[PDB]
């Protein structure tokens, strides 16, 4: 159960391609989390 940045998820556990699932838009993000 892994998708890309444009994939879309509800939790970070979904991101397996070195992405971070933001709780804002509920979608994976590149460069991991954003500060």
UniProtKB/Swiss-Prot annotation:
Any one GO biological process: envenomation resulting in positive regulation of voltage-gated sodium channel activity in another organism
DNA-binding recorded as keyword: no
InterPro entries reported for this sequence: Huwentoxin-1
GO terms, molecular function: ion channel inhibitor activity; potassium channel regulator activity; sodium channel regulator activity; toxin activity
Keywords, alphabetical: Disulfide bond, Ion channel impairing toxin, Knottin, Neurotoxin, Pharmaceutical, Potassium channel impairing toxin, Secreted, Toxin, Voltage-gated potassium channel impairing toxin, Voltage-gated sodium channel impairing toxin
Expression sites by tissue: Expressed by the venom gland.
Disulfide bridge positions per record: 2-16, 9-21, 15-28
One of the record's GO cellular component terms: extracellular region
UniProt cross-references to Pfam families, sorted A to Z: Toxin_12
Record's subcellular location: Secreted
UniProt domain comment: The presence of a 'disulfide through disulfide knot' structurally defines this protein as a knottin.
Further details from the record: Shows poor stability in cerebrospinal fluid and moderate stability in human serum. Half-life of the toxin is about 1.7 hour in cerebrospinal fluid. Half-life of the native toxin is about 10 hours in human serum.
Family: Belongs to the neurotoxin 10 (Hwtx-1) family. 09 (HaTx) subfamily.
Function: Gating-modifier toxin that potently inhibits inactivation of the mammalian Nav1.1/SCN1A sodium channel (EC(50)=38 nM). Also moderately inhibits inactivation of Nav1.2/SCN2A (EC(50)=236 nM) and Nav1.3/SCN3A (EC(50)=220 nM) when the channels are expressed in oocytes without the beta-1 auxiliary subunit. Does not inhibit inactivation of Nav1.2/SCN2A when the channel is coexpressed with the beta-1 auxiliary subunit. When tested on Nav1.1/SCN1A channel, it enhances peak current amplitude and potently delays channel inactivation in a dose-dependent manner, leading to a large sustained current.
Identification of the protein by name: Delta-theraphotoxin-Hm1a
